[PDB]
Amino acid sequence: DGTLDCISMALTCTFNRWGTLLAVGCNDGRIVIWDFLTRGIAKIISAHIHPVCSLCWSRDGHKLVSASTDNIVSQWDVLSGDCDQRFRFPSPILKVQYHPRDQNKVLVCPMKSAPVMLTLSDSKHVVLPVDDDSDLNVVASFDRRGEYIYTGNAKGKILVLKTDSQDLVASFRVTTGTSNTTAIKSIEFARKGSCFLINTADRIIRVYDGREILTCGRDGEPEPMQKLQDLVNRTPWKKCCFSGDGEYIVAGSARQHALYIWEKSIGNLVKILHGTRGELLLDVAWHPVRPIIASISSGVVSIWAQNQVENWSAFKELDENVEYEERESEFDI
């Protein structure tokens, strides 16, 4: 539905705060900041020699946190492209995430170690707690306002901490239905409201409302707002994301390189988008204020927009025949 030839080795992308720019990582380890309106590249940053697998914009948009595969995280000013700060860790980093309401702070999910929240002003770090002490794979994310931290382990356990004190404000383990746990693949939140989603190893996305987890307390049984899956193919989900408003949810079937689109309230599947059967789906993102969806597959990015009835359909356009309502004086002088 529209691709870009000007970028190669697309690996990970991230919309800015207003959905005007897109920073995509490349295998060479370069940042390609490409613009939507001019439909061209806005910037090229020599980030790492190692490909970049995690990228996040700052709220003001002037900072981008990038993670190399060399366990090298670095902050870059979008105007200049300089490495503002640079750090390295053990257990290679799985993800970075700016704090949405404090760009000085940034959480980092490493591979084998617990996620740690650092600051840029001071090169300090706060190691977030781990429930089972043996997960070795815990994804973590700020909420919409950056007030709480949601951490999900490979054993389905879900901890909600407060971002400042790291104190356990809520907890619950998700189930595979019967009695078993499932590897929490990812935690996503809505940029609007409080609904969030969890991708798990059961190939079943679970949509909740964080207020219900907060009122559920520690070690409770919160039910999901929704349960979403491909009941037909039972396909895993490499990457999923909400819509900009938060009423549409998309999942990327890397198994068959497709895109499933459900709703939030009803949860019925909006639609499906099919990509090149030969392409391996890698990354998925939604335009924050547009029905536009960016996909990264086999190093190539594709764009999926959604237009209205007009752009040619605007006499007064009607859809179905209209019986004329004759009047009393319809034949009168």
């Binding site: 004329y324 004759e326 034949f331």
Partner: protein
Amino acid sequence: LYRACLYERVLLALHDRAPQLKISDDRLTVVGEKGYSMVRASHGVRKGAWYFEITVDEMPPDTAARLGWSQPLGNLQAPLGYDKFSYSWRSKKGTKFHQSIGKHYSSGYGQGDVLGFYINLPEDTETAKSLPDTYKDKALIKFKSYLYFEEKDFVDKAEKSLKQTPHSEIIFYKNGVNQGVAYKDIFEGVYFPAISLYKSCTVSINFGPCFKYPPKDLTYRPMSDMGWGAVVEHTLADVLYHVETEVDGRRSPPWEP
């Protein structure tokens, strides 16, 4: 063959209604759904003076029936007065409508009006001043499941000269009370009582023997009387046509009647 009419009394002929015109024989009321339409009675006047009524059973604001007379050539989809061969009244305010022209030379109309309609056309002498021969056409057809007869009707007249039938007139009454003269200028050609419907209008025509405020004239005739008169006349028409084609010769008495 014969022109036998599917009617117990002289009623609104179903043969001369539009496909968008509904009837209820509980009161023989007529109703429609979209715009205007026109229906006519079974009979048709050619001479003399006569009289009938229309009873209105439903008149919402977006419901305006029209009631009057119309000659053949009257397109039954038009609102009874759109052409020069029809003269009616609009049932919102008493307004005479002819040639689609509305005239306020009339009284006021009421929602529950039982309106009387008097009309006098001259004898066929002053109507034709010549032969009023009635050589009829008759064609047999077998439509989907029933037999029917086709005849040739008159053609759209381009008449633009005014030659009113002598001493012919139309008078309108509200419950017998004289609403006044409607049209003195009456063109030649047979006329029949007609009803036009707007969106969901409920009105019905009615004859004389069950009347409410009838005139006591000894010359005017109810709907039923002229009805069986015309029925017998068309019976004789069939008689004479089968005579013509079947037996040599024809002969009729001293012409005057």
